Design a protein around this ligand. Structure first.
Ligand SMILES: CC1=C(/C=C/C(C)=C/C=C/C(C)=C/C=C/C=C(C)/C=C/C=C(C)/C=C/C2=C(C)C(=O)CCC2(C)C)C(C)(C)CCC1
Ligand SMILES: CC1=C(/C=C/C(C)=C/C=C/C(C)=C/C=C/C=C(C)/C=C/C=C(C)/C=C/C2=C(C)C(=O)CCC2(C)C)C(C)(C)CCC1
Lengths: 301, 302
């Protein structure tokens, strides 16, 4: 079973504080949510700078952005609350149709306009609720890797269409990773092809019924689904695995675990996220299941 | 706005450790989830015993319970994993159609059969994962009030509208009235009294047509039709025991009232007193536009 494979290398300690904090955040009042994120990014931006959104991304979020700017300050803040409350709204429906990167670039743009004053800002001297206060304190106590994940997910969870697929990296321009302990070809091809945005080659590593499980999400099942996931969300990452361990599995399978770091194009090398990959390969070396964990600490490798 | 009303009495500290812990639980392996609940249940049972499920409830879950028993051990544990993983399954679909009380009684009965051996039990000596172990430690460090809420919610979230029969409102002469230090408000007192009497028809009349009720850690349930369905499906045989409250003016001639006290669920009777806050937003005529029910972080929140 795919669902059973979810339990390989059960010693792996994932940072479940992330979804735990996201759950707390979700309980909050809409204006409190917006205020909290404002407060958090304002303080993170002091040391971490967000990569400017892509051109195609901006073009796609341009209509919604203009519409909000045309609104009066009241309607502006009301439309932001709608996004936050996951209200049924034309704006929220369009927002929901966006890929994570477009949603992110959408809010990236609102944040500038708010600081400039052209869009209704978080009220001045605004005070967070008792609960909201605690949630922000928890966030600020987190590793940057976990901080940005918490923010990314809170944004993706709002609302009620993706970027263009960049061409695979030129073959001669590609680099190969090395993993202490792991020479397995599937694992190595996985890493290399993903770093080269070669999703077409990547997907061929999977079994037809194979699954990929992103951090704190359910397994994405089937080649069609996994490939869409690659094309919509997994562009321009930098996988930097370090060590791995190789073990036999039931029915002639092989389970491999690799730990290392990953970089998002949104923050580049300024935020190195601690990641574990858990592979379950069939006898022919096909990926039946691969899980990506955000690790609790560097103490997880 | 209903969603804006969600922010009344903002300094009220709710036990968001509950949904946080539920979020951690959900990340877990299906088998680790079942084992964890088994472990927590087995330890809680030491000092807190669960009330037996209702007869009507049992009859309603009887078919599903039978089917699972007829299965071989392997298929039994697999069906249990389906529920946990929220797999798309005829069983899960039937489970999903049930009211929380029926789901709960369903599992109540499975647990007896497992302890008796008639249904495949949690593998002996089984070891929880790193993450699963932590989640159990957090649960065991919680107040019983928050422990049972965590378990209730984990169960309700399983599967992929069948409900118990509505009990008759308590005889009018037999009804008690609550008292609340500082609060003589008629709506508030009627709310408490009618609920304790299972008189939902009278109770629902206190709401504005577009009024909402927000259960702990849930979104506002909006509209008299929806709220009343909620009353009939989930809110029978509660015991509300408010203690004090504070009354304040609100925008547009409204009035916001906050009441703190305890609540008892028929599942545990007086063995678990939950710390609860009520936050009312009443319109000029005294209709409930919004009422939120919070599980409080600590007795220090009363
Ligand atoms: C909201 C809001 C505002 C704006 C907030 C902004 C602007 C926040 C921007 C946050 C961003 C920029 C977050 C970026 C997160 C990036 C992440 C978390 C990347 C993680 C990638 C991973 C870990 C991928 C791992 C993978 C691996 C390695 C595989 O092996 C397979 C594929 C895959 C699974 C993908 C303001 C302030 C105005 C206030 C009002 C409301
Ligand atoms: C799973 C599982 C198993 C069985 C587990 C079982 C059997 C667990 C049973 C637990 C139960 C029985 C918990 C019950 C909790 C009930 C609660 C938490 C009630 C709280 C009610 C409140 C707070 C309502 C407040 C209200 C107020 C006062 C209002 O003003 C308006 C209405 C409302 C909002 C309703 C075993 C072990 C075999 C292992 C395998 C898997």
């Amino acid at each position: 079973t795919i669902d059973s494979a979810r339990g390989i290398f059960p010693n792996t300690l994932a940072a479940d504080v992330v979804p735990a904090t996201i759950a707390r955040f979700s309980q909050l009042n809409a204006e409190d949510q917006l205020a909290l994120i404002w407060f958090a990014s304002l303080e993170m931006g002091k040391t971490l700078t967000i990569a400017a959104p892509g051109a195609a991304s901006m073009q796609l979020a341009e209509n919604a952005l203009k519409e909000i700017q045309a609104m009066g300050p009241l309607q502006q803040t009301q439309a932001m609350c709608d996004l936050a409350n996951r209200a049924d709204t034309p704006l929220c429906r369009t927002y929901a149709s966006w890929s994570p990167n477009i949603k992110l670039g959408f809010w990236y743009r609102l944040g500038e306009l708010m600081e400039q004053g052209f869009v209704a800002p978080i009220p001045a001297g605004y005070q967070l609720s008792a609960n909201a206060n605690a949630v922000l304190a928890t966030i600020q106590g987190l590793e940057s890797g976990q901080q940005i994940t918490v923010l990314r997910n809170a944004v993706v969870d709002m609302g009620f269409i993706a970027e263009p697929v960049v061409p695979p990296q030129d073959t001669a321009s590609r680099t190969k990773v090395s993993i202490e302990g792991v020479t397995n070809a599937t694992v190595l091809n996985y890493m290399d092809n993903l770093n080269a945005n070669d999703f077409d080659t990547l997907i061929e590593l999977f079994t037809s019924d194979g699954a990929l499980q992103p951090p704190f999400q359910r397994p994405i099942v089937g080649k069609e689904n996994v490939l869409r996931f690659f094309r919509e969300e997994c562009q321009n990452l930098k996988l930097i695995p370090e060590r791995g361990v190789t073990e036999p599995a039931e029915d002639g399978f092989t389970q491999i675990k690799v730990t290392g770091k990953v970089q998002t194009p949104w923050f580049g090398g300024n935020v190195g996220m601690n990641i574990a990959w858990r592979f379950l390969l069939n006898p022919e070396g096909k990926i039946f299941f691969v899980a990506i964990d955000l690790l609790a600490s560097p103490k997880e490798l």
